[PDB]
Amino acid sequence: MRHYEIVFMVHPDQSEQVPGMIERYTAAITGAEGKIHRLEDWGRRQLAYPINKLHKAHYVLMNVEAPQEVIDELETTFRFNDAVIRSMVMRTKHAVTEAS
Template sequence: MRHYEIVFMVHPDQSEQVPGMIERYTASVKEAGGQVHRLEDWGRKQLAYPINKLHKAHYVLMNVEAPQSVIDELETNFRYNDAVLRNLIVHTKSAVTEASPMVKAKESKAVEAVADVTEEAGE
């Protein structure tokens, strides 16, 4: 089985459906004997350019180890799901389990915000 990094963008009005979509996609990977090494829900983000007159989208990142048949099935699901605006599936050399730069940046901002609040409370 090969390792893949999958990123897909969901229509912002369909954000409440994202957990169900993630569950469905991870279940199809696991049913075929694959593994999900990393799963990150980045939430709504500003797009670099409008897609279908939309300026925001809900992003999801998955790193999986799966057979090609599952990847073909996921591509088909992405293509025929109107809520998925864009997707990218890339073959990787090995499993990626560490946090992505997006999550690291979010965590560092949260730590800085907590530090600022504690400084203000201490003054």
């Protein structure tokens, strides 16, 4: 298998319903026997410009182990649902302890 980070920016005042929206498509990687190590918040951060009308993000980390011929099927599954921008996939070396 191959490892990826896959981080979602997430609006802090919808951060209790956005992880369930990502889990509306996780069948696209658990169908390939992918293993998901958190799909969870890390901590609020501030931006130098607004993303989805807000200068802040809640940062929700997936941390996944999967085959290599399914990472383009997964990023195409988010091509039109308007939850993925600038990849944020960050391949290889896998997660650090508790993501620090």
